[PDB]
């Protein structure tokens, strides 16, 4: 609470009640700043404290962009994913539609070459 703004951002976790955790989160979050932000949200919830650190998470930036013509038999959504300092509010700006953060592991989006 200042002159600098957190935004609103709307973010999936696997914690039930409410499974997309809205938040207000700062302007210049990015995925692992809102990855720990959530970490927060979920602090024991459904336990996603597994991994108490933000550097084993990667965030989506999921933006859903329906179908005008028959591709999908329901709009859907055109999922992205993020690296530690993809900028989340630089992510929501990317947006051609309107979608939501996911909180996911990296170690769970395991198809990003090696990491280790």
Do not use: M
Not at 16 to 36: C, F, G, H, M, W
Not at 87 to 102: D, E, R
């Amino acid at each position: 609470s200042s002159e600098e703004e957190s935004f609103f951002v709307q973010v999936h976790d696997v914690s039930p009640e409410q499974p997309l955790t809205v938040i207000k989160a700062p302007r210049v979050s990015t995925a692992q700043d809102v990855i720990q932000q959530t970490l927060c949200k979920a602090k024991y919830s459904y336990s996603i404290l597994s991994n108490p650190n933000p550097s084993d998470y990667v965030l989506l930036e999921e933006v859903v962009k329906d179908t005008t013509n028959k591709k999908t038999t329901t709009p859907k959504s055109s999922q992205r994913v993020l690296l530690d300092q993809e900028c989340v509010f630089q992510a929501q700006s990317k947006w051609k539609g309107a979608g939501k953060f996911i909180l996911k592991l990296k170690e769970q989006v395991q198809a990003s070459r090696e990491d280790k």
